[PDB]
Design a binder for this molecule. Structure first.
Ligand SMILES: Cc1cc2nc3c(=O)[nH]c(=O)nc-3n(C[C@H](O)[C@H](O)[C@H](O)COP(=O)(O)O)c2cc1C
Length: 135
């Protein structure tokens, strides 16, 4: 666990959630700047996106709207899904990754496990270290 980095770094986490699983997931981290895609009218600092998956492995509409406006500051993406969907499992992360040329930080089920939290937070630190100065 890199809780010290999570709680001290200035990295921003922006998420999208409909039934609250993504919300619950990010609340398992120690990141301090956590806001939903719908509660800001501008983004001026680099950020990490955590979203969910809708019909047929699609990116939620609210996330697509957000990205076409602030994808220039996107560092990487993580997506919540459900393996019941097979090949469409958390496909929004793959779509966003290819579309905006950013790395996939993690793909997990529903609210995630402690293992998902660990992998996600470690990847955020790696990408911030590698792309912060650049971004
Ligand atoms: C209409 C609908 C379509 C969904 N489609 C997919 C899908 O294609 N792939 C997947 O992995 N999960 C799919 N899911 C599952 C959600 O991505 C999953 O439950 C997610 O954790 C929900 O996050 P929410 O609380 O953040 O918004 C779907 C759920 C609903 C209600």
């Amino acid at each position: 666990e890199n809780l010290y980095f999570q709680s001290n770094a200035m990295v921003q986490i922006i998420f999208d959630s409909k039934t609250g699983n993504v919300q619950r997931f990010v609340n398992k981290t120690g990141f301090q700047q956590i806001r939903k895609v719908d509660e800001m009218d501008h983004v001026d600092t680099p950020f990490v996106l955590v979203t969910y998956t809708t019909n047929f492995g699609q990116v939620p509409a609210s996330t697509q709207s957000f990205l076409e406006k602030y994808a220039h500051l996107l560092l990487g993406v993580a997506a919540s899904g459900n393996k019941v969907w097979g090949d469409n499992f958390a496909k929004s992360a793959d779509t966003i990754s290819r579309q905006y040329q950013v790395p996939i930080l993690h793909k997990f089920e529903l609210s995630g496990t402690s293992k998902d939290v660990e992998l996600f937070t470690q990847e955020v630190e790696r990408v911030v270290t590698k792309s912060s100065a650049k971004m």
